[PDB]
Design a protein around this ligand. Structure first.
Ligand code: AMP
Length: 508
């Protein structure tokens, strides 16, 4: 049963059961379906169906976000989710390359909001349309794009991963069946919908008839409020990045007693530290922990493995598990040949979860996707190895990093930093003494200025970067110098610059 038919079924059978909950607001399955059907109708009156143009859905975790997501696919348009977290210029870039002809913001027209070069409308005024609706044949289907999520692009511009219904349906069927999340449970949603991790809870919940429960950025900053919301949520499934749960764990009160009904933790998008797993197994004896791996290009996650005490003591580094049933995952050397067990190589993913590629970016798709031995495959850029059918992720081959669960390209940050009128060159160094990245240091060659003090220059640049880059991509520290060290080849000497940056670190 297709995701959409499943959502309609629940709405027809259990209309009054809650589908969505966020900041005191609730949306029943009937309200969800009937509203998304109305938005879908309203949408077909403002844009053309000639193309399968994307529809940006802008907001945070309002009930209107999902009502709009569903409205787009039901109208026949893939949607591009955009969090308030994403700044205006970046939003302008997504618009520009996506070809999107409509932007819906779940909240009322934000006052003095940054105007965009696109037809803009609030979810509210969309719904004031007659009680119209769309016919089943309009809904997105098969390999037509369902959603498009943009991630970091090394060339300095976000690239959009196209996830077709089939893609998602493959992901959703996998989660709902092979994980104890079925049964109409309450799912937590912490990740903004602009990140695909959210999809791990959003749709398997909707397909299984569960109730989604959001915890917004407001509650996230005020620990007390958060734990309170979590306390009342009565959640059963916890889906988030390991980083977020790690933050919660710092509070001794975060335990089975705060969440008596919590029984399933779903993690993905980043390294799940043994310490986090170890700890969770302690404060939540009634909940099983799952570690899953995968890139956005392969629809959230394609590997899986329950984390038990047995597994913890069996390895210093948690494995990412066994390949999704229908997926074919293997290790390939540089030459592009399959390696044997235990031998380190690059992770490649082939199967129905793989995205057709980057929207309007053929050359990029060209380098990353390809037809392996039938299956459509993807070069993850992750180094790794398999052992007894169990996959292990071991680092990066490129300049793509993970900072507190956030995916980003050092070269993209360098691009944006280099754009400031006060910058000539820029090199971002990630401080990772051991395994994980702790923060970023920007090595900059400034143009020429009148700023009396450095902090003023740093401030000016950082104030600029806030318009094109999400806050988490802006380097914490900024150091300045005269020249960017280069190697023989003519490449940027990142190894040497890092050493430079740390030496200057001891000079106060
Ligand atoms: N479970 C995991 N354990 C370790 N690393 C992971 C895991 N899941 C994802 N990653 C890393 O995060 C990257 C994907 O980022 P994203 O597109 O935001 O999901 C993967 O290519 C890995 O580098």
């Amino acid at each position: 049963m297709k995701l959409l038919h499943a959502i309609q079924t629940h709405a027809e059978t259990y209309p009054q059961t809650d589908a969505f909950r966020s900041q005191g607001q609730s949306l029943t399955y009937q309200e969800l379906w009937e509203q998304s059907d109305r938005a879908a109708a309203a949408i077909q009156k403002r844009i053309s169906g000639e193309k399968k143009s994307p529809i940006l859905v802008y907001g945070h975790m309002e009930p209107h976000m999902i009502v709009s997501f569903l409205g787009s696919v039901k109208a026949g348009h893939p949607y591009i989710p955009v969090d308030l977290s994403i700044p205006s210029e970046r939003i302008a870039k997504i618009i520009e390359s996506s070809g999107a002809e409509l932007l819906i913001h779940a909240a009322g027209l934000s006052i003095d909001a940054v105007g965009q070069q696109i037809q803009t409308v609030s979810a509210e005024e969309l719904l004031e349309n007659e009680g119209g609706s769309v016919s089943q044949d309009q809904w997105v289907k098969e390999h037509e794009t369902f959603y498009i999520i943009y991630t970091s692009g090394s060339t300095g511009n976000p690239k959009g991963v196209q996830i077709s219904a089939a893609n998602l349906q493959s992901f959703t069927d996998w989660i709902c069946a092979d994980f104890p999340v079925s049964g109409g449970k309450i799912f937590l949603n912490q990740a903004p919908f602009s990140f695909d991790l959210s999809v791990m809870d959003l749709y398997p919940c909707l397909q299984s008839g569960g109730t989604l429960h959001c915890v917004t950025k407001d509650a996230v900053n005020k620990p007390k409020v958060l734990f309170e919301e979590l306390k009342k949520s009565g959640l059963n499934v916890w889906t988030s990045t390991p980083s977020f749960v790690q933050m919660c764990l710092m509070d001794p009160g975060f335990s089975q007693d705060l969440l008596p009904h919590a029984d399933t933790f779903m993690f993905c998008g980043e390294v799940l530290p043994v310490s986090v797993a170890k700890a969770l197994l302690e404060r939540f004896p009634k909940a099983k922990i799952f570690n899953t791996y995968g890139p956005t290009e392969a629809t959230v996650a394609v590997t899986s493995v329950e984390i038990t005490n047995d597994v913890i003591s069996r390895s210093e580094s948690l494995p990412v598990g066994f390949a999704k049933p229908d997926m074919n995952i293997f290790i390939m050397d540089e030459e592009g040949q399959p390696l044997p067990e235990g031998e380190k190589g690059e992770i490649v993913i082939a199967g129905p979860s793989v995205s057709r590629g980057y929207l309007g970016e053929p050359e990029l798709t060209e380098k990353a996707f390809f037809s392996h031995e039938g299956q459509w495959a993807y070069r993850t850029g992750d180094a790794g190895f398999i052992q007894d059918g169990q996959i292990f992720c071991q680092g990066r081959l490129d300049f793509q990093i993970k900072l507190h669960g956030y995916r980003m390209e050092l070269e993209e940050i360098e691009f944006h930093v280099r754009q400031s009128q006060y910058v000539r060159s820029a090199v971002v160094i990630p401080y990772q003494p051991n395994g994980t990245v702790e923060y970023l240091i920007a090595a900059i060659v400034p143009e020429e200025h009148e700023f009396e003090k450095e902090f003023q220059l740093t401030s000016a640049i950082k104030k600029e970067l806030a318009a094109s880059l999400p806050a988490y991509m802006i380097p914490r520290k900024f150091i300045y110098q005269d020249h960017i060290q280069m190697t023989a080849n003519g490449k940027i000497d990142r190894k040497r610059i890092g050493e430079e940056v740390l030496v200057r670190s001891h000079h106060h």
